[PDB]
């Protein structure tokens, strides 16, 4: 061959908070195969949407949508139990194969995206310039969304452990933890990274007796 196919933009999926999670880094020569494991956002969630994106922006909306499919039939389970393995496989012909398989159940759904799909050679240059120009705001969006996601994770896991401890949790601890949960829940609604991180830390500080019930 005289030529190799190389990705000019990151490829990946939309994850919680409308952020792009990259499966295939830009400047990758094909063929290539990459996979990452995702999970559900809620207890008893029966489906996940695989929204395939191309671009260098952090907000899913600012990137090029290549397609979407659902993986459904996820049997009821705790948040984080399902193991949704998402595979991006680009063959020699430049066709993107997207697979999502729950490795717990072997249930799988797929799409194929044609080598022609996505941004053109002008739009690629337009996308690279936008990412360059928006680099700082894009980073602050990504760091805020991730900090909220982390607060959300602590909030859910701490609530689970309160539920499990039941009547064994003393009243001083129950009152302090419930009150710390409300405070973090309120912080997540804001745009202040530091405020969410402080409420995470204050919850962690009062929850130590909680984990000592096991």
């Amino acid at each position: 061959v005289l030529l190799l196919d190389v990705t000019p933009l990151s490829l990946g999926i939309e994850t919680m908070g409308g952020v792009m999670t990259t499966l295939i880094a830009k400047n990758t020569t094909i063929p290539t195969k990459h996979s990452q494991v995702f999970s559900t956002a809620e207890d008893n969630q029966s489906a996940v949407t695989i929204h395939v994106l191309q671009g260098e922006r952090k907000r899913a909306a600012d990137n090029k949508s290549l397609g979407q499919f659902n993986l459904d039939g996820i049997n009821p389970a705790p948040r984080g139990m399902p193991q949704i393995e998402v595979t991006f496989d680009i063959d020699a012909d430049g066709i993107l194969h997207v697979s999502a398989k729950d490795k717990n159940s072997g249930k799988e759904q797929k799409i194929t995206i044609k080598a022609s799909s996505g941004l053109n050679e002008d739009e690629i240059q337009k996308m690279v310039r936008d990412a360059e120009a928006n680099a700082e705001a894009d980073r602050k969006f990504e760091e805020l969304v991730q900090t909220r996601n982390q607060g959300d994770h602590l909030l859910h896991s701490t609530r689970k452990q309160v539920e499990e401890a039941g009547d064994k949790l003393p009243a001083d601890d129950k009152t302090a933890i419930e009150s710390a949960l409300t405070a973090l829940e309120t912080a997540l609604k804001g745009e202040d990274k530091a405020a969410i991180e402080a409420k995470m830390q204050e919850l962690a500080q009062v929850s130590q007796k909680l984990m000592e019930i096991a």
Binding site: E14, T15, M16, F38, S46, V48, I50, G80, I84, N149
Partner: peptide, 14 residues
């Protein structure tokens, strides 16, 4: 869009 979240890969103590 049924929400899909990151899964925290585990780390060992060496």
């Amino acid at each position: 869009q049924s929400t899909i979240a990151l899964a925290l890969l585990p780390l060992l103590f060496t």
